[PDB]
Amino acid sequence: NEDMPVERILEAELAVDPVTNICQAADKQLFTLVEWAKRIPHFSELPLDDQVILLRAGWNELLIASFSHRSIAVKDGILLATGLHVHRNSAHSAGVGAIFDRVLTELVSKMRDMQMDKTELGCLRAIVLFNPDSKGLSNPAEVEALREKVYASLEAYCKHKYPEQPGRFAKLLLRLPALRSIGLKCLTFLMEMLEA
Protein backbone atom coordinates (compact mmCIF):
# COMPACT_ATOMS: atom_id res chain seq x y z
CA ASN A 1 0.00 0.00 0.00
CA GLU A 2 0.98 3.64 0.71
CA ASP A 3 4.53 3.23 2.08
CA MET A 4 4.97 6.97 2.05
CA PRO A 5 2.49 8.17 4.70
CA VAL A 6 1.16 11.62 3.82
CA GLU A 7 0.66 11.90 7.57
CA ARG A 8 4.40 11.80 8.27
CA ILE A 9 5.12 14.07 5.28
CA LEU A 10 2.68 16.67 6.57
CA GLU A 11 4.20 16.29 10.01
CA ALA A 12 7.64 17.23 8.67
CA GLU A 13 6.16 20.27 6.96
CA LEU A 14 4.63 21.20 10.32
CA ALA A 15 7.90 20.58 12.21
CA VAL A 16 9.27 23.72 10.53
CA ASP A 17 18.17 45.42 1.30
CA PRO A 18 15.09 43.46 0.22
CA VAL A 19 17.59 40.87 -1.05
CA THR A 20 19.35 40.76 2.34
CA ASN A 21 16.04 40.08 4.08
CA ILE A 22 15.56 37.06 1.78
CA CYS A 23 19.16 35.84 2.12
CA GLN A 24 18.81 36.11 5.89
CA ALA A 25 15.54 34.19 5.65
CA ALA A 26 17.34 31.44 3.70
CA ASP A 27 20.05 31.05 6.34
CA LYS A 28 17.46 30.66 9.08
CA GLN A 29 15.85 27.87 7.05
CA LEU A 30 19.04 26.22 5.82
CA PHE A 31 19.17 24.81 9.33
CA THR A 32 15.87 22.96 9.10
CA LEU A 33 16.48 21.04 5.89
CA VAL A 34 18.13 18.16 7.74
CA GLU A 35 15.41 18.11 10.36
CA TRP A 36 12.70 18.35 7.71
CA ALA A 37 14.17 15.60 5.52
CA LYS A 38 14.80 13.68 8.74
CA ARG A 39 11.05 13.42 9.15
CA ILE A 40 10.46 12.27 5.53
CA PRO A 41 9.80 8.50 5.30
CA HIS A 42 12.78 6.37 4.29
CA PHE A 43 15.16 9.37 3.89
CA SER A 44 17.18 8.53 7.02
CA GLU A 45 17.73 5.00 5.77
CA LEU A 46 19.63 6.33 2.76
CA PRO A 47 23.43 6.39 3.06
CA LEU A 48 24.62 9.54 4.82
CA ASP A 49 26.67 10.48 1.75
CA ASP A 50 23.56 10.38 -0.48
CA GLN A 51 21.42 12.30 2.00
CA VAL A 52 23.99 15.12 1.78
CA ILE A 53 23.91 14.91 -2.01
CA LEU A 54 20.11 15.17 -2.13
CA LEU A 55 19.97 18.20 0.13
CA ARG A 56 22.93 19.77 -1.61
CA ALA A 57 21.08 19.36 -4.92
CA GLY A 58 17.57 20.12 -3.65
CA TRP A 59 18.06 22.81 -1.03
CA ASN A 60 17.16 25.88 -3.02
CA GLU A 61 14.00 24.49 -4.64
CA LEU A 62 13.08 23.07 -1.24
CA LEU A 63 13.32 26.52 0.27
CA ILE A 64 11.51 28.29 -2.57
CA ALA A 65 8.40 26.09 -2.57
CA SER A 66 7.90 26.70 1.18
CA PHE A 67 8.05 30.48 1.36
CA SER A 68 5.93 30.47 -1.80
CA HIS A 69 3.16 28.52 -0.15
CA ARG A 70 3.37 30.73 2.90
CA SER A 71 2.86 33.83 0.79
CA ILE A 72 -0.50 32.60 -0.53
CA ALA A 73 -1.92 35.08 2.00
CA VAL A 74 0.05 38.23 1.16
CA LYS A 75 -1.40 40.12 -1.79
CA ASP A 76 1.73 41.22 -3.70
CA GLY A 77 4.82 39.68 -2.15
CA ILE A 78 6.18 37.05 0.19
CA LEU A 79 6.16 36.40 3.93
CA LEU A 80 9.74 35.52 4.91
CA ALA A 81 10.66 33.11 7.72
CA THR A 82 12.03 36.17 9.53
CA GLY A 83 8.44 37.36 9.92
CA LEU A 84 9.13 40.22 7.52
CA HIS A 85 7.49 40.89 4.17
CA VAL A 86 8.71 41.82 0.72
CA HIS A 87 6.45 43.72 -1.64
CA ARG A 88 6.70 43.58 -5.44
CA ASN A 89 7.64 47.26 -5.65
CA SER A 90 10.82 47.08 -3.54
CA ALA A 91 11.79 43.87 -5.31
CA HIS A 92 11.67 45.79 -8.61
CA SER A 93 13.43 48.79 -7.10
CA ALA A 94 16.18 46.50 -5.83
CA GLY A 95 16.65 44.77 -9.20
CA VAL A 96 15.28 41.26 -8.75
CA GLY A 97 11.79 42.05 -10.04
CA ALA A 98 11.66 39.66 -13.00
CA ILE A 99 12.63 36.67 -10.86
CA PHE A 100 10.29 38.03 -8.19
CA ASP A 101 7.25 38.09 -10.48
CA ARG A 102 7.98 34.57 -11.75
CA VAL A 103 7.70 33.38 -8.14
CA LEU A 104 4.51 35.34 -7.60
CA THR A 105 2.85 34.35 -10.88
CA GLU A 106 4.14 30.80 -11.44
CA LEU A 107 4.22 29.73 -7.78
CA VAL A 108 2.49 31.92 -5.19
CA SER A 109 -0.47 32.85 -7.38
CA LYS A 110 -0.96 29.30 -8.70
CA MET A 111 -0.83 27.71 -5.25
CA ARG A 112 -3.57 30.07 -4.11
CA ASP A 113 -5.87 29.68 -7.10
CA MET A 114 -5.90 25.90 -6.56
CA GLN A 115 -5.47 26.17 -2.81
CA MET A 116 -2.87 23.42 -2.67
CA ASP A 117 -2.68 22.20 0.89
CA LYS A 118 0.21 21.59 3.28
CA THR A 119 0.07 17.85 2.57
CA GLU A 120 0.37 18.53 -1.15
CA LEU A 121 3.16 21.08 -0.86
CA GLY A 122 4.99 18.56 1.31
CA CYS A 123 4.69 15.71 -1.17
CA LEU A 124 5.97 18.04 -3.88
CA ARG A 125 8.92 18.97 -1.67
CA ALA A 126 9.47 15.25 -1.10
CA ILE A 127 9.62 14.74 -4.88
CA VAL A 128 12.14 17.55 -5.33
CA LEU A 129 14.19 15.99 -2.50
CA PHE A 130 14.18 12.45 -3.90
CA ASN A 131 16.04 13.43 -7.08
CA PRO A 132 17.94 10.44 -8.51
CA ASP A 133 19.74 12.49 -11.16
CA SER A 134 22.02 14.33 -8.69
CA LYS A 135 25.71 13.56 -9.34
CA GLY A 136 27.61 11.27 -7.00
CA LEU A 137 24.60 9.29 -5.86
CA SER A 138 25.64 5.89 -4.48
CA ASN A 139 22.38 4.17 -5.38
CA PRO A 140 20.30 6.33 -7.78
CA ALA A 141 17.72 3.59 -8.39
CA GLU A 142 17.09 3.57 -4.63
CA VAL A 143 16.21 7.28 -4.68
CA GLU A 144 14.29 6.70 -7.92
CA ALA A 145 12.17 4.08 -6.14
CA LEU A 146 11.51 6.45 -3.25
CA ARG A 147 10.42 9.24 -5.62
CA GLU A 148 7.84 6.96 -7.25
CA LYS A 149 6.45 5.97 -3.83
CA VAL A 150 5.71 9.65 -3.44
CA TYR A 151 4.06 9.63 -6.90
CA ALA A 152 1.72 6.85 -5.81
CA SER A 153 0.98 8.27 -2.37
CA LEU A 154 0.36 11.81 -3.64
CA GLU A 155 -2.08 10.47 -6.22
CA ALA A 156 -4.04 8.30 -3.81
CA TYR A 157 -4.23 11.32 -1.51
CA CYS A 158 -5.60 13.53 -4.32
CA LYS A 159 -8.08 10.95 -5.60
CA HIS A 160 -9.66 10.33 -2.18
CA LYS A 161 -9.32 13.87 -0.81
CA TYR A 162 -10.41 15.78 -3.94
CA PRO A 163 -12.50 13.21 -5.91
CA GLU A 164 -14.33 16.07 -7.63
CA GLN A 165 -11.05 17.22 -9.19
CA PRO A 166 -9.74 14.32 -11.33
CA GLY A 167 -6.88 16.36 -12.72
CA ARG A 168 -5.46 17.61 -9.42
CA PHE A 169 -2.52 15.18 -9.19
CA ALA A 170 -1.29 16.12 -12.69
CA LYS A 171 -1.84 19.77 -11.83
CA LEU A 172 0.52 19.56 -8.84
CA LEU A 173 3.37 17.95 -10.80
CA LEU A 174 3.07 20.63 -13.50
CA ARG A 175 4.21 23.09 -10.86
CA LEU A 176 7.59 21.35 -10.75
CA PRO A 177 8.94 22.44 -14.15
CA ALA A 178 8.33 26.04 -13.10
CA LEU A 179 10.00 25.38 -9.75
CA ARG A 180 13.02 23.92 -11.51
CA SER A 181 13.46 26.89 -13.87
CA ILE A 182 12.89 29.37 -11.06
CA GLY A 183 15.40 27.47 -8.93
CA LEU A 184 18.05 27.70 -11.64
CA LYS A 185 17.61 31.42 -12.16
CA CYS A 186 17.83 31.95 -8.39
CA LEU A 187 21.50 31.00 -8.71
CA THR A 188 35.31 40.21 17.78
CA PHE A 189 37.32 37.08 18.67
CA LEU A 190 40.13 37.85 16.26
CA MET A 191 40.33 41.27 17.91
CA GLU A 192 40.59 39.66 21.36
CA MET A 193 43.14 37.10 20.20
CA LEU A 194 45.20 39.90 18.67
CA GLU A 195 45.14 41.93 21.89
CA ALA A 196 45.78 39.03 24.30
Binding site: A152, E155, G167, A170, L176, P177, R180, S181
Partner: protein, 238 residues
Protein backbone atom coordinates in the same frame (compact mmCIF):
# COMPACT_ATOMS: atom_id res chain seq x y z
CA UNK B 1 -12.60 7.57 -17.84
CA UNK B 2 -11.80 7.01 -21.52
CA UNK B 3 -10.77 8.69 -24.75
CA UNK B 4 -13.55 10.20 -26.84
CA UNK B 5 -13.66 10.02 -30.66
CA UNK B 6 -12.54 13.65 -30.64
CA UNK B 7 -9.48 12.95 -28.51
CA UNK B 8 -8.55 9.92 -30.56
CA UNK B 9 -8.90 12.08 -33.67
CA UNK B 10 -6.73 14.84 -32.16
CA UNK B 11 -4.04 12.32 -31.23
CA UNK B 12 -4.05 10.84 -34.74
CA UNK B 13 -3.81 14.37 -36.18
CA UNK B 14 -0.73 14.92 -34.01
CA UNK B 15 1.01 11.71 -34.96
CA UNK B 16 0.18 12.39 -38.62
CA UNK B 17 1.54 15.95 -38.43
CA UNK B 18 4.82 14.64 -36.97
CA UNK B 19 5.19 11.92 -39.61
CA UNK B 20 4.49 14.54 -42.26
CA UNK B 21 7.24 16.79 -40.90
CA UNK B 22 9.59 13.76 -40.94
CA UNK B 23 9.03 13.13 -44.65
CA UNK B 24 9.54 16.72 -45.72
CA UNK B 25 12.71 16.90 -43.59
CA UNK B 26 13.96 13.67 -45.05
CA UNK B 27 13.14 14.89 -48.55
CA UNK B 28 15.15 18.04 -47.86
CA UNK B 29 18.11 16.20 -46.36
CA UNK B 30 20.45 16.70 -49.33
CA UNK B 31 20.47 20.44 -48.54
CA UNK B 32 22.77 19.88 -45.54
CA UNK B 33 26.58 20.11 -45.71
CA UNK B 34 28.01 16.55 -45.80
CA UNK B 35 29.72 14.82 -42.89
CA UNK B 36 33.48 15.07 -43.67
CA UNK B 37 41.38 13.97 -36.00
CA UNK B 38 43.44 16.99 -34.97
CA UNK B 39 41.95 18.85 -37.90
CA UNK B 40 40.25 22.17 -37.21
CA UNK B 41 38.61 22.25 -40.64
CA UNK B 42 36.96 18.84 -40.16
CA UNK B 43 35.81 19.95 -36.70
CA UNK B 44 34.28 23.11 -38.16
CA UNK B 45 32.58 21.12 -40.92
CA UNK B 46 31.01 18.75 -38.35
CA UNK B 47 29.66 21.77 -36.46
CA UNK B 48 28.39 23.32 -39.68
CA UNK B 49 26.70 20.01 -40.38
CA UNK B 50 24.99 19.88 -36.95
CA UNK B 51 23.78 23.49 -37.11
CA UNK B 52 22.34 22.79 -40.55
CA UNK B 53 20.47 19.76 -39.19
CA UNK B 54 19.21 21.77 -36.24
CA UNK B 55 17.83 24.46 -38.57
CA UNK B 56 15.91 21.72 -40.40
CA UNK B 57 14.54 20.54 -37.02
CA UNK B 58 13.44 24.07 -36.07
CA UNK B 59 11.35 24.13 -39.27
CA UNK B 60 9.77 20.77 -38.29
CA UNK B 61 8.81 22.18 -34.86
CA UNK B 62 7.27 25.32 -36.31
CA UNK B 63 5.33 23.39 -38.97
CA UNK B 64 4.10 21.07 -36.20
CA UNK B 65 3.18 23.92 -33.85
CA UNK B 66 1.21 25.72 -36.57
CA UNK B 67 -0.90 22.57 -36.73
CA UNK B 68 -1.77 22.44 -33.00
CA UNK B 69 -5.40 23.32 -32.18
CA UNK B 70 -5.43 26.92 -30.98
CA UNK B 71 -1.78 27.76 -31.56
CA UNK B 72 -2.41 30.25 -34.38
CA UNK B 73 -5.25 31.79 -32.40
CA UNK B 74 -2.61 33.28 -30.09
CA UNK B 75 -0.74 36.55 -30.54
CA UNK B 76 2.22 36.11 -32.89
CA UNK B 77 4.09 37.51 -29.92
CA UNK B 78 3.09 34.55 -27.79
CA UNK B 79 3.69 32.07 -30.62
CA UNK B 80 7.27 33.22 -30.99
CA UNK B 81 7.87 33.13 -27.24
CA UNK B 82 6.46 29.58 -26.94
CA UNK B 83 8.57 28.32 -29.87
CA UNK B 84 11.75 30.13 -28.79
CA UNK B 85 11.97 28.41 -25.40
CA UNK B 86 10.33 25.07 -26.28
CA UNK B 87 12.64 24.49 -29.26
CA UNK B 88 15.55 22.85 -27.47
CA UNK B 89 13.17 20.80 -25.35
CA UNK B 90 11.32 19.40 -28.34
CA UNK B 91 14.65 18.60 -30.02
CA UNK B 92 15.80 16.69 -26.96
CA UNK B 93 12.52 14.72 -26.82
CA UNK B 94 13.09 13.95 -30.54
CA UNK B 95 16.64 12.92 -29.66
CA UNK B 96 15.38 10.46 -27.02
CA UNK B 97 12.80 9.05 -29.43
CA UNK B 98 15.66 8.39 -31.87
CA UNK B 99 18.13 6.90 -29.38
CA UNK B 100 19.59 3.49 -30.28
CA UNK B 101 20.35 1.70 -26.98
CA UNK B 102 22.51 -0.91 -28.71
CA UNK B 103 25.08 1.34 -30.39
CA UNK B 104 24.36 4.17 -27.95
CA UNK B 105 23.78 6.51 -30.87
CA UNK B 106 21.13 8.86 -32.15
CA UNK B 107 19.79 8.53 -35.66
CA UNK B 108 18.37 11.69 -37.31
CA UNK B 109 16.62 11.90 -40.74
CA UNK B 110 16.54 8.12 -41.29
CA UNK B 111 20.21 7.55 -42.24
CA UNK B 112 22.25 9.97 -40.10
CA UNK B 113 23.52 8.21 -36.94
CA UNK B 114 25.76 9.86 -34.34
CA UNK B 115 27.42 8.65 -31.15
CA UNK B 116 29.16 10.54 -28.33
CA UNK B 117 32.41 10.83 -30.25
CA UNK B 118 30.73 12.38 -33.28
CA UNK B 119 29.38 15.17 -31.09
CA UNK B 120 32.77 15.55 -29.36
CA UNK B 121 34.62 15.73 -32.72
CA UNK B 122 32.37 18.65 -33.59
CA UNK B 123 33.68 20.42 -30.48
CA UNK B 124 30.78 19.81 -28.06
CA UNK B 125 31.79 19.41 -24.41
CA UNK B 126 31.19 16.35 -22.24
CA UNK B 127 29.07 18.22 -19.63
CA UNK B 128 26.63 18.75 -22.49
CA UNK B 129 26.92 15.42 -24.33
CA UNK B 130 26.65 13.13 -21.27
CA UNK B 131 23.46 14.39 -19.63
CA UNK B 132 21.66 14.39 -23.01
CA UNK B 133 22.72 10.83 -23.71
CA UNK B 134 21.80 9.92 -20.14
CA UNK B 135 18.39 11.58 -20.68
CA UNK B 136 17.83 9.72 -23.96
CA UNK B 137 18.70 6.36 -22.46
CA UNK B 138 16.27 6.91 -19.56
CA UNK B 139 13.46 8.05 -21.93
CA UNK B 140 14.07 5.06 -24.14
CA UNK B 141 13.54 2.71 -21.19
CA UNK B 142 9.99 4.11 -20.91
CA UNK B 143 9.36 2.82 -24.44
CA UNK B 144 6.96 5.62 -25.36
CA UNK B 145 5.12 5.28 -28.68
CA UNK B 146 4.15 7.83 -31.37
CA UNK B 147 1.05 9.02 -29.54
CA UNK B 148 2.89 9.48 -26.27
CA UNK B 149 5.74 11.46 -27.83
CA UNK B 150 3.35 13.65 -29.84
CA UNK B 151 1.41 14.58 -26.69
CA UNK B 152 4.51 15.10 -24.53
CA UNK B 153 5.81 17.47 -27.24
CA UNK B 154 2.51 19.41 -27.35
CA UNK B 155 2.48 19.68 -23.56
CA UNK B 156 6.03 21.05 -23.70
CA UNK B 157 5.07 23.61 -26.36
CA UNK B 158 2.06 24.85 -24.39
CA UNK B 159 4.07 25.94 -21.32
CA UNK B 160 2.65 29.15 -19.85
CA UNK B 161 5.70 30.02 -17.76
CA UNK B 162 7.95 30.60 -20.79
CA UNK B 163 9.45 34.09 -20.71
CA UNK B 164 7.37 36.78 -22.43
CA UNK B 165 4.06 34.93 -22.64
CA UNK B 166 1.09 37.32 -22.69
CA UNK B 167 -2.05 35.17 -22.34
CA UNK B 168 -0.72 32.61 -19.86
CA UNK B 169 -4.32 31.72 -18.99
CA UNK B 170 -5.15 30.57 -22.52
CA UNK B 171 -1.84 28.73 -22.90
CA UNK B 172 -2.65 26.74 -19.74
CA UNK B 173 -6.12 25.92 -21.07
CA UNK B 174 -4.57 24.62 -24.32
CA UNK B 175 -1.98 22.60 -22.43
CA UNK B 176 -4.64 21.09 -20.19
CA UNK B 177 -6.32 19.49 -23.21
CA UNK B 178 -3.19 17.46 -24.01
CA UNK B 179 -2.38 16.57 -20.39
CA UNK B 180 -5.95 15.32 -19.98
CA UNK B 181 -5.59 13.27 -23.19
CA UNK B 182 -2.22 11.83 -22.13
CA UNK B 183 -3.60 10.76 -18.76
CA UNK B 184 -6.60 9.08 -20.31
CA UNK B 185 -4.33 7.54 -22.97
CA UNK B 186 -1.91 5.97 -20.46
CA UNK B 187 -4.65 4.62 -18.27
CA UNK B 188 -6.31 2.95 -21.25
CA UNK B 189 -3.16 1.60 -22.91
CA UNK B 190 -0.99 0.97 -19.79
CA UNK B 191 -3.72 -0.09 -17.30
CA UNK B 192 -1.33 -1.87 -14.93
CA UNK B 193 1.42 0.76 -15.09
CA UNK B 194 -0.04 3.99 -13.64
CA UNK B 195 3.40 5.37 -12.69
CA UNK B 196 3.95 5.86 -16.44
CA UNK B 197 2.03 9.15 -16.43
CA UNK B 198 3.80 10.77 -13.46
CA UNK B 199 7.11 9.62 -14.94
CA UNK B 200 6.38 11.17 -18.31
CA UNK B 201 5.40 14.50 -16.79
CA UNK B 202 8.59 14.50 -14.76
CA UNK B 203 10.65 14.48 -17.99
CA UNK B 204 9.30 17.99 -18.54
CA UNK B 205 11.21 18.96 -15.38
CA UNK B 206 14.53 17.48 -16.58
CA UNK B 207 14.15 19.35 -19.86
CA UNK B 208 14.31 22.59 -17.87
CA UNK B 209 17.80 21.69 -16.67
CA UNK B 210 18.85 20.29 -20.03
CA UNK B 211 17.77 23.57 -21.62
CA UNK B 212 20.09 25.37 -19.22
CA UNK B 213 22.99 23.01 -19.98
CA UNK B 214 22.44 23.71 -23.70
CA UNK B 215 22.71 27.47 -23.07
CA UNK B 216 26.10 26.80 -21.44
CA UNK B 217 27.17 24.69 -24.42
CA UNK B 218 26.32 27.67 -26.65
CA UNK B 219 28.53 30.00 -24.61
CA UNK B 220 31.50 27.70 -24.89
CA UNK B 221 31.18 27.17 -28.57
CA UNK B 222 31.56 30.97 -28.61
CA UNK B 223 34.90 30.58 -26.76
CA UNK B 224 35.87 28.61 -29.86
CA UNK B 225 34.54 31.32 -32.15
CA UNK B 226 31.77 28.99 -33.38
CA UNK B 227 28.72 31.24 -33.56
CA UNK B 228 25.24 30.03 -34.36
CA UNK B 229 23.78 30.85 -37.80
CA UNK B 230 21.16 33.66 -37.84
CA UNK B 231 18.02 31.57 -37.14
CA UNK B 232 19.63 29.55 -34.34
CA UNK B 233 21.23 32.68 -32.86
CA UNK B 234 17.88 34.41 -32.71
CA UNK B 235 16.46 31.43 -30.79
CA UNK B 236 19.40 30.49 -28.59
CA UNK B 237 21.79 33.44 -28.17
CA UNK B 238 19.68 36.54 -27.71
Amino acid sequence: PQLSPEQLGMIEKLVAAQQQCNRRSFSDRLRVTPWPPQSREARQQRFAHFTELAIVSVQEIVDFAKQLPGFLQLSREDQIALLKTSAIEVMLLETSRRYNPGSESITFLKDFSYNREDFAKAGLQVEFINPIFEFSRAMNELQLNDAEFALLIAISIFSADRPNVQDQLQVERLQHTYVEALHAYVSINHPHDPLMFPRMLMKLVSLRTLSSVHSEQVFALRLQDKKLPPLLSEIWDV
